[PDB]
Structure formats: structure tokens, C-alpha cells
Write an enzyme that holds these catalytic residues in place. Structure first.
Site, mmCIF file in Angstrom:
data_model
loop_
_atom_site.group_PDB
_atom_site.id
_atom_site.type_symbol
_atom_site.label_atom_id
_atom_site.label_comp_id
_atom_site.label_asym_id
_atom_site.label_seq_id
_atom_site.Cartn_x
_atom_site.Cartn_y
_atom_site.Cartn_z
ATOM 1 N N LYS A 1 -4.211 -4.210 11.781
ATOM 2 C CA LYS A 1 -3.253 -4.173 10.592
ATOM 3 C C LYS A 1 -1.783 -3.234 11.599
ATOM 4 O O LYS A 1 -1.689 -2.692 12.516
ATOM 5 C CB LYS A 1 -3.534 -3.242 9.617
ATOM 6 C CG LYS A 1 -2.625 -3.118 8.417
ATOM 7 C CD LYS A 1 -2.721 -2.236 6.938
ATOM 8 C CE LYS A 1 -2.796 -0.631 6.863
ATOM 9 N NZ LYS A 1 -1.387 -0.382 7.652
ATOM 10 N N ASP B 1 9.350 -8.165 -3.094
ATOM 11 C CA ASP B 1 10.565 -8.501 -3.670
ATOM 12 C C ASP B 1 10.611 -10.297 -4.084
ATOM 13 O O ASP B 1 9.211 -10.037 -4.377
ATOM 14 C CB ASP B 1 11.504 -9.161 -1.362
ATOM 15 C CG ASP B 1 12.683 -8.757 -2.211
ATOM 16 O OD1 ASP B 1 13.855 -9.089 -2.447
ATOM 17 O OD2 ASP B 1 13.719 -8.395 -0.272
ATOM 18 N N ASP C 1 -0.673 2.032 13.968
ATOM 19 C CA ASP C 1 0.675 2.228 13.695
ATOM 20 C C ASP C 1 1.629 3.144 15.527
ATOM 21 O O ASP C 1 0.821 4.590 14.880
ATOM 22 C CB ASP C 1 0.275 3.369 12.973
ATOM 23 C CG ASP C 1 0.034 1.806 11.523
ATOM 24 O OD1 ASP C 1 0.869 1.142 11.320
ATOM 25 O OD2 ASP C 1 -1.093 2.301 10.766
ATOM 26 N N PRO D 1 -7.884 1.564 2.309
ATOM 27 C CA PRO D 1 -7.383 2.434 2.998
ATOM 28 C C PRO D 1 -7.666 3.700 2.984
ATOM 29 O O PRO D 1 -9.011 4.130 2.356
ATOM 30 C CB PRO D 1 -5.510 2.411 3.133
ATOM 31 C CG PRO D 1 -5.730 2.399 1.974
ATOM 32 C CD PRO D 1 -6.806 0.879 1.356
ATOM 33 N N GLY D 2 -7.307 5.269 3.263
ATOM 34 C CA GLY D 2 -7.647 6.523 2.539
ATOM 35 C C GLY D 2 -8.574 6.826 3.024
ATOM 36 O O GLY D 2 -9.740 7.442 2.567
ATOM 37 N N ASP E 1 1.009 -5.282 6.800
ATOM 38 C CA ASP E 1 0.933 -4.698 5.701
ATOM 39 C C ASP E 1 2.827 -4.579 6.244
ATOM 40 O O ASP E 1 3.144 -3.232 6.510
ATOM 41 C CB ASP E 1 0.108 -3.725 5.944
ATOM 42 C CG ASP E 1 0.605 -2.563 4.678
ATOM 43 O OD1 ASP E 1 0.634 -2.916 3.505
ATOM 44 O OD2 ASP E 1 -0.640 -1.060 5.032
ATOM 45 N N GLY F 1 -6.534 4.434 10.748
ATOM 46 C CA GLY F 1 -5.152 4.445 11.965
ATOM 47 C C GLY F 1 -5.046 5.202 12.781
ATOM 48 O O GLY F 1 -6.390 4.893 13.956
ATOM 49 N N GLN G 1 -9.512 13.887 5.819
ATOM 50 C CA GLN G 1 -9.040 14.307 4.894
ATOM 51 C C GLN G 1 -9.054 12.657 3.263
ATOM 52 O O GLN G 1 -8.229 12.770 2.542
ATOM 53 C CB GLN G 1 -7.346 15.041 4.229
ATOM 54 C CG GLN G 1 -7.279 15.459 3.755
ATOM 55 C CD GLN G 1 -6.000 17.415 4.356
ATOM 56 O OE1 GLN G 1 -7.016 17.465 5.651
ATOM 57 N NE2 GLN G 1 -5.342 17.463 2.737
ATOM 58 N N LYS H 1 3.727 -4.101 2.733
ATOM 59 C CA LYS H 1 3.787 -3.309 1.424
ATOM 60 C C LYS H 1 5.055 -4.243 1.177
ATOM 61 O O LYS H 1 5.449 -3.835 0.277
ATOM 62 C CB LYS H 1 4.227 -1.347 1.267
ATOM 63 C CG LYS H 1 3.605 -0.510 2.134
ATOM 64 C CD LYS H 1 2.323 -1.315 1.320
ATOM 65 C CE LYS H 1 1.214 0.473 1.651
ATOM 66 N NZ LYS H 1 0.808 0.329 2.941
HETATM 67 CL CL LIG Z 1 -1.973 2.902 -0.377
#
Ligand SMILES: [Cl-]
Ligand code: NI
Ligand code: NI
Lengths: 199, 199
Positions: free
Chosen positions: A30, A61, A9, A152-153, A56, A175, A157, A58
Site C-alpha cells: 500500500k 473528490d 509508510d 487495516p486496523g 491509498d 504498516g 492495539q 483516501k
Molecule cells: Cl480506515
């Protein structure tokens, strides 16, 4: 290689620099809207030179549109794409598809993620939030090694490096924590994917 | 004021030409996957020269990402941006946000769209399927003219032109049918937006 998919990113040239630097050291990259906005879909093919690319956007559609979108992405070199499980039963499927069934933030998935997970088949795998290792573990219990789990995540934190993998994930998606200093990938050195060697 | 937003689901040069031709004759243009993939985000600014631009990438990411994507698109010339309501309560807010709460295809929205509709406030409006006029009408009994409603799913294979507007929509979104023959916009001549003069 380390069980890490690096989220690029960032700007096009910097993303290519990171992919060149980390080729063969990580499991994949990614690519998201940050990169695609800059010059278009061609960036997928450039990153794909250096490793497995998960696109990604997301994807959420209707089928004839989602079909075209996934096709364009895979044609440009993507190994696979992340799509939203909430589309079910109108869900893109096949070995190129990762299905998101719970997010890292609160959403309508929260009340139904395990039922949704159990209902979906004929996909490459699932995206589960690595900031909730208990969710990752329950997911792996439900599905065993029948499908990939990527998470992810992971990072500041969220789940500490390896937390999702230890809970049952195959790969963690990271990321900024890695982009700001790619030498930090060494924190994943001890870990191996739970079920699958590649994303 | 034809209550029609034309979806530029086509190539960049053709999209420019169509937008130049339709300048001031329609309510706006929907820029999506196909254009962004080809021309990157710059296409948003180019189409904005000819009319209001609604960007439709079905945004469905965690709200920090989503809000920054909305802002970036708006900064490049977009009037507003479509996002998925499924992410509630982690949804972006504000006057640039249209919230999709039910699709033209079967999805998990179908069991909860009205509850979701009633839960979402402080956005520009909602996207509801024009191939289901009953849904548009029920949405108005719930929200009145408090927010905009725009509707895709209008065409030979969906709802008849005006079907959604008559049911309560402000604007209908039409792509291929109009692109094939732009003279067809005349079919919307007898209709006017139900609540809001602009999208
Ligand atoms: Cl997510
Ligand atoms: Ni893959
Ligand atoms: Ni708008």
C-alpha cells in the site's frame, strides 16, 4: 503468499528495499502520501515492479477530478485505489476501485456503513476496519464472496494478526508492525484469504 | 484584494509562470493532486514564493495521519489545508484546517451538511459549493463571521463570478477558466470578501 498487504509508510528508498525483500512473500503493498510527497507519482511504478500496489490517498473528490486521479495512478502501475464511499452517489467505480465504508476511527460512516455497503456495486471490493472483526463478519455475511474485503486496523492495539481474515476478510493491511521487523510476517503464515486469492 | 484563489490545476512549469504573473493580484493559489503528483511536495514551497498556498488533496484520513499531513504541508509553505468534514468527530483541528462539508457534486454530505457545519468548531473555515449560493447564505445564518468560507464551483458551468461571495463567501476558487486567460480575474474586481480580508 501470505494474505497481507504491507503499508509502505516510509521513505522512498526504504520502501523499495522492503518491497524487494518481500516480493512474492506478501499479497501486495500500500502506497500513500508519505511516498508520493517525496518525489511524486513515479514511486507507484517503482513499487509496482515488485508486487500488486494499492494506492491509498483516501480519494474523495468530484467525478471528473477523481477520474483523472485514478487514471494517473493506474497508468503508473497501481492495481487498484482506495476511495471514500461517502461520495455516493458520485462514487468512482470499476474493478480498480476499493470503496471505504467504515474507518478505523469514529466517523459519520458509523451510523450508515451497512446501508452504504449494500447500495454499492460494480467495484473491486470494500475496505472494512479490521479492529472491528464483528463489522468485517457482518459485511461478509451481507455480500458473500461477490467482492473483496481488505482490512487495516491490524496490529498492536487493533485486531491481532489474522483476526480480520478469520472474520471474513481477504487481506489485512499492516504498516509499522511489519516495517519495524519484516520477519514478523510469519505470524500470518497459517491464514488464507476468505474469498479471493489476490487483492 | 481580489477575493479569488486561483486553482493551479495544471503542469508544474505553467503553474509557476501563472503564479509569478498573478503575484499580489489574487488572494492565493490552490495546489492539488496534479501538481503534487508531478513535482512531489516541493511544489508547495515553490508556489508559496508567489502567494498564500491552500493545499487541496481532500484529506480524508484518520486524524493522526491527517494532522501530520497538515503539519508537513504547512511546514513546506502551505498556509492551510482542505480536509473532509465527514470524518467528524475524528477531525483535525486548528487554524490551518479548512473543512469541506458539502461538494459541488451529489454526496452523502447533502443530507446533513448543515448539522455537520454547526458541529465543527475550532478550525480556520469551511468549504461550501459556489454552484449552490443558497447553501453559502444558509451557512452564514448559522455561523456568521465566526469562520472563513471559501467556495469552488464558480465558472461557466457553475456559479457566476461573485455569486458565492455575494451569498456570503470570503473567497471563490477558480481553476481552468482563469488559467485559460488570466485577464479574466478582472471579473472579480467589484467584489470583496464577506467576513475575512485573507483566506
Ligand atoms: Cl480506515
Ligand atoms: Ni488491488
Ligand atoms: Ni489559508
Amino acid at each position: 503468499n501470505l494474505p497481507l498487504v504491507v503499508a509502505l509508510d516510509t521513505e522512498v528508498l526504504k520502501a523499495i528495499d522492503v518491497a524487494k525483500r518481500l516480493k512474492g512473500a506478501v499479497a501486495g503493498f500500500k502506497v500513500g502520501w508519505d511516498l508520493i510527497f517525496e518525489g511524486g507519482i513515479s514511486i507507484v511504478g517503482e513499487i509496482a515492479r515488485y508486487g500488486n500496489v494499492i494506492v491509498d490517498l483516501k480519494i474523495a473528490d468530484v467525478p471528473h477530478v477523481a477520474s483523472r486521479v485514478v487514471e494517473k495512478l493506474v497508468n503508473r502501475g497501481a492495481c487498484c485505489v482506495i476511495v471514500h464511499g461517502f461520495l455516493h452517489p458520485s462514487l468512482p467505480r470499476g474493478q480498480h476501485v476499493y470503496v471505504l465504508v467504515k474507518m478505523t476511527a469514529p466517523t459519520i460512516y458509523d451510523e450508515m456503513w451497512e446501508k452504504l455497503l449494500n447500495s454499492v456495486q460494480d467495484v473491486r471490493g470494500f475496505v472494512l476496519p479490521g479492529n472491528q472483526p464483528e463489522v468485517v463478519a457482518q459485511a461478509r455475511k451481507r455480500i458473500g464472496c461477490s467482492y473483496r474485503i481488505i482490512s487495516p486496523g491490524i496490529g498492536p492495539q487493533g485486531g491481532r494478526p489474522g483476526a480480520a481474515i478469520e472474520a471474513g476478510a481477504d487481506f489485512e493491511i499492516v504498516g509499522r508492525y511489519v516495517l519495524e521487523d519484516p520477519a514478523r510476517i510469519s505470524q500470518w503464515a497459517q491464514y488464507r484469504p476468505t474469498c479471493f486469492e489476490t487483492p
